Amino acid sequence: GSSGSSGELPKKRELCKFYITGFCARAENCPYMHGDFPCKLYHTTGNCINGDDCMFSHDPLTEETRELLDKMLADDAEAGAEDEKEVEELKKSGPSSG
Ligand SMILES: [Zn+2]
Ligand SMILES: [Zn+2]
């Protein structure tokens, strides 16, 4: 990357709230980012659980994209919701059969 600049046009460079799952009514009509968008996990720590077959792009962050994360994260991180959690049972005792 050398230019960095990006003409000012009506295009959302954010992670579509649908792409996350894959059910986005508008495919090529989605003003948001789908693939190009850089992977989060791959960055959060460096390695992605998915692997080489990730649904997200693993390209090297750029002066541009970089700005995205700053927002995406800030939004999510800041706005966090509580969710139940527990430790599933490995193996509960069972009766006998004869
Ligand atoms: Zn979309
Ligand atoms: Zn990934």
Curated annotation (Swiss-Prot):
Acidic residues: bias regions: 77-87
C3H1-type ZnF: 10-37, 38-61
Compartments, as annotated in UniProt: Chromosome
Membership in a protein family: Belongs to the suppressor of sable family.
Role of this protein: RNA-binding protein that suppresses transcription of long non-coding RNAs (lncRNAs). LncRNAs are defined as transcripts more than 200 nucleotides that are not translated into protein. Together with WDR82, part of a transcription termination checkpoint that promotes transcription termination of lncRNAs and their subsequent degradation by the exosome. The transcription termination checkpoint is activated by the inefficiently spliced first exon of lncRNAs.
Subunit structure: Interacts with WDR82.
Protein name: Zinc finger CCCH domain-containing protein 4
